[PDB]
Amino acid sequence: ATRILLLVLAVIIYGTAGFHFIEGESWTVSLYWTFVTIATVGYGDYSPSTPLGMYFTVTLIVLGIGTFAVAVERLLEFLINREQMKLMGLIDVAKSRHVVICGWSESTLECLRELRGSEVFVLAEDENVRKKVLRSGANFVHGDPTRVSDLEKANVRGARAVIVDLESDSETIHCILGIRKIDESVRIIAEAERYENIEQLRMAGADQVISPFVISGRLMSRSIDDGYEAMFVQDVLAEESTRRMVEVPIPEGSKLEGVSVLDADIHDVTGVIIIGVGRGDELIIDPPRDYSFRAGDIILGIGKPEEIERLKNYISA
Amino acid sequence: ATRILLLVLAVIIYGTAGFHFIEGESWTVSLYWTFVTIATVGYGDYSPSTPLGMYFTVTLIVLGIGTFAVAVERLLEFLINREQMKLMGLIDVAKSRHVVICGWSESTLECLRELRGSEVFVLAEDENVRKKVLRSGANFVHGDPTRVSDLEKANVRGARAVIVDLESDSETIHCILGIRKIDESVRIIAEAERYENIEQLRMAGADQVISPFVISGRLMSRSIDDGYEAMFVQDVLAEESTRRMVEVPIPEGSKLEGVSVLDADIHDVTGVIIIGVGRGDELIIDPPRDYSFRAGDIILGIGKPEEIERLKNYISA
Amino acid sequence: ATRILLLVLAVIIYGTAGFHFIEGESWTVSLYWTFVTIATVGYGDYSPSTPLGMYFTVTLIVLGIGTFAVAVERLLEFLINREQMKLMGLIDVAKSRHVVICGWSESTLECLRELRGSEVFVLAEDENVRKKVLRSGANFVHGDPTRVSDLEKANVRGARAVIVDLESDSETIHCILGIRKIDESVRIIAEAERYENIEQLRMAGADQVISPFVISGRLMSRSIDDGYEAMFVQDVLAEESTRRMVEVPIPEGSKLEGVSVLDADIHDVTGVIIIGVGRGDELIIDPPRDYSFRAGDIILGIGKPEEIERLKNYISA
Amino acid sequence: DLEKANVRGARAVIVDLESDSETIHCILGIRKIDESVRIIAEAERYENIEQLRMAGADQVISPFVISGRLMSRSIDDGYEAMFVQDVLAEESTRRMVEVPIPEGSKLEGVSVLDADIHDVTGVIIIGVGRGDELIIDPPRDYSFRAGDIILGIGKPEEIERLKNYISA
Amino acid sequence: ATRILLLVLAVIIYGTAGFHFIEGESWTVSLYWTFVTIATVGYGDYSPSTPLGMYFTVTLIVLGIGTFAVAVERLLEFLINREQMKLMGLIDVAKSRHVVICGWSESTLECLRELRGSEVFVLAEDENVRKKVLRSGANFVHGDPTRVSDLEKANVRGARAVIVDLESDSETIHCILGIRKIDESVRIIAEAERYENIEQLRMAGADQVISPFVISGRLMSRSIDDGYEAMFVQDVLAEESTRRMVEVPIPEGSKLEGVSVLDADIHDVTGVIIIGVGRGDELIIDPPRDYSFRAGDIILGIGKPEEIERLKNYISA
């Protein structure tokens, strides 16, 4: 570890004391000479012509070779051990604005195509998951995502948001109960599977719960006959062919703070159906006529992307 | 990444400004001197005798050692990471006249003994398949051969022909439907398993469909009693003991363009049974007497290899 | 292996005989010159101006490059083979005050949080166990823990204590019968699973047998109705919330050697319930009034941690 | 599938599954069915002892923490494991017993110093328990009731003298 | 591959033509100078003082660094790829007096403790078998031991003897039928499992067939009552506690060539029960009184190891 540096200094004390006491030169020239011959520069103006110096320089050169051989084998031991540790996980995460994804499935693959690559750390235990993440462009941290000691190696104490989707519901509930032990304030997003588990996933402490299997189960059995809601939910939320469900913020100033929805009259002006307003971690779906807009509220609406731009200038100052 | 080069230039600016302002030498000699001492050449004719220069050269040598230690550890990090990425697949293919083989079985092993080795890229997901391909002399690209994003890493946009044989029929139909999404014009060869799937494998877009299991199923149940067609199909198509089924082209000129099959009279002249002629991606099995040969057509025939040579001179000019 | 050193000396004999017989210089100056040019130092005061020497030095430099290329490839072969052997187990243990743990489960994970890390060698055969041990901070020795030849690679002939917990009872009995073949005097701790196997685990030769499954089985069926013993055993032996079960030794002198338990009267003085005294590998649970304390005996007791300190000063001199 | 076994209305439910995640999720389902049924879990890791309590189990028994701490303390000395193995598992000589105080039987209002149980019976009074809270090692300023449970350690000969001692 | 050497020579032609045409020196001194500065020796007696030479030497040094960086990365690419190929099998065997063992079980582990280590190449396809062989001290060749192309990589064309024990009988019969295709004369030893397969294992071409399962099956059902033959076969063939079954050769001369078994009278002289004589790949169990010994025959006998020595001097001349 640290012994190579003391070996370097010991050979320096050997060379200086050998030059000064045999060639009879001063201290500074002996320091300069051992620092020029230890790097094999060889200017050649302070060379020892003395035969005792002619034999002493041989030992100085051979111990210089031995020192540069033990330092190189130490560097290669450290580099090979680090690039073999880092390849199969087994590393500690040191970032602080990153996104930790526990588990790996198709639903967490579709959220990497809307994020950047080296910002996202997938924490899982399988070996095929490792090759899929290293293919897809994120980082891999080998761990058991339920165990609290394997959550702190992904550093969820300073993570931006944590997205949890594991292979069952029991492991998802346990990962959320583990995450709320470390950092109480981080934002956790989970995926439920059964219908009866959404109440447990909220009581365990998840901030946002998505449940796609009950969505498709309710959309299948109500599309046997006509299937008109399925076209809406597919065309708007999944593919975004003709529409897109947007949420736009109301910035400071912004020319309509304090008026009602009747006075602004957004649907005839722009063409965007306002669904609701999000005043601070709640949603008023279909706000009434007597709602007055504030600062920092967010209008949720559906429209073609050229109507979203016509709304984003009607709000802006 | 790029910081090592700027480190090299920074130490160059340090050494030049140290030599020119302390030894009092010109600019060009200071540039030459730092370029000779940074590589430990040491000619020794422009050496600094000044004690401030005697201490400054020590710092120049130690920072030269530090730069040559950070560049070496960067080179070793890059080389070890590249030879560990390339070993387990995980690489992008950059050739443009190569053959991509999706999947691995015995039928795709027998087509490597009729191709060259580094021309063929086997794309699969198993780990035993990796060792078998690295044994057999092709290249391995780790991917899921149904997924479109794992087909473009094998670069089927510029591949010569793609040969598809996966573990089921459903994965073969899906790989063909994926390949016809990327490059519409590439030539795809597939292997069917069930009899009812050849119509789907043609409607999905494969150019040539081979189905060996129905061939053996029809040859087994018609060889219980006598088994005479089985000897023909084995001896000609599989082992090629005494015959070989050949296809020979008609080149330009070639002394028989425009005559009929009756006027050429190939079977009595040569001894090769003409089966059919391939005028441009179709086959006329047993052409009639009134067929006239054209340029670029191909005669398909069965014969001993010394009769194929007697045909290949009867066609040539 | 050893041929590189003889190559170095052969090139030394070549360079000395080349300098002395062509430049006509003495023996010692030729030795010095080949030792300065073989390391590329180049002082430049004994340089050969002779054109035969001008061609001979080229061969000396090229063979010096060849020697420094074969030694570097030998060093890299040895270092890469050693860091690939050591990573997947496959190494021999050379310490002599270490703790060998055969097998891996949750009960042997909770004993690493009360020991140091590089003192403990986990011997197992699985591959997931390897990543869990390399995560947890111990060392991993790949072996089959029943086989006697794979026990001597973990070096149980000079180990401090061996802790055995395998996946069954049959493998635990076989590992204990294997350990008592190598070193007869080492201390073995085992974990039993079934109730009927504790007599076999003692007759095979284990020094201390723990059996947690029968403990929980007897605590479950006696906590259906009231569950008061379960609170005691949990609160004292598992969590150590308010109490802790201590064993304190009686050192030499220690102000109470020779008095009885009635004369010392530990419970009213301190508040620690004395359970028993351990005079040399036996336990007298509830010692009578007529027990006299000796030197080196150990008092086993339960109490709050500030009563254990009030006992540890009442015993001390 | 829990209402098929009718976990609503039972003496107790004993939960011991293959892992801790399924034990947590099973206790959370049993508390969705019935709020007053008595659950006894088995915790595997250490940090799941608080989670199995917060989910709602009334009694958590963690054998793996017990065994993993008795392994790392018996490397040198090894006298704690002998007491645990000879009183809780094998029951060779002694055993832990919990006996209650019946109604109007020699002891309602009696302090612990003039109870003198260790010297009239021989059983070590570890603690006294009244209504699912344990008072380990009760002090001298303490009065018994009818309905408390005395927790003690002793030979099976002495527990009979104790059960004779606390009758009417 | 080969381009680095031509790069070295191209930089040599650059340096020689640069020195000779700018410094104006001769050809040989320019060759010497580029060979001294390309290795960073730096004697310093032929240094270019010309400013065009002062700039030209910089380019010579930088291209020397570039050449020594591309050769080092080529050497590291080759060494890392070779030590990663050789670790997981994937190598061709080049010895010619070696023993190839196909498959791995307990019966082939007990024959490594009677052979040397680097003489024996275990050919198998599993991954746990790899770690067990690399533990046990032999070499591992990754292959499928039935496939003929994976038998020639273990080089059974020049192997001394091949020992075959696979996981079934069908794979053993197929490995023997594959080995007799490559080298017809090699000595093959097999292990049978079922009783009915010994005739197939001899008709396929094995030279010696051992079948331990039928041996134990016949020894179990004849040791229910008394078990006296089991003690003999165990004590003599397995453990060799008091006896050992020996085969001793009759060398040339050897003082008893031509006499009968009655005239030699080996059992009363020595105490070794002669079982049979092996005159050239056959066995005459209990030879008659009228057998005459020849040269090169081999006496098979059972005895204590001090009677085998008393026989080995009674035979010797």
Ligand SMILES: [Ca+2]
């Ligand atoms: Ca999911």
Ligand SMILES: [Ca+2]
């Ligand atoms: Ca197939």
Ligand SMILES: [Ca+2]
């Ligand atoms: Ca266990």
Ligand SMILES: [Ca+2]
């Ligand atoms: Ca359990």
Ligand SMILES: [Ca+2]
């Ligand atoms: Ca076998």
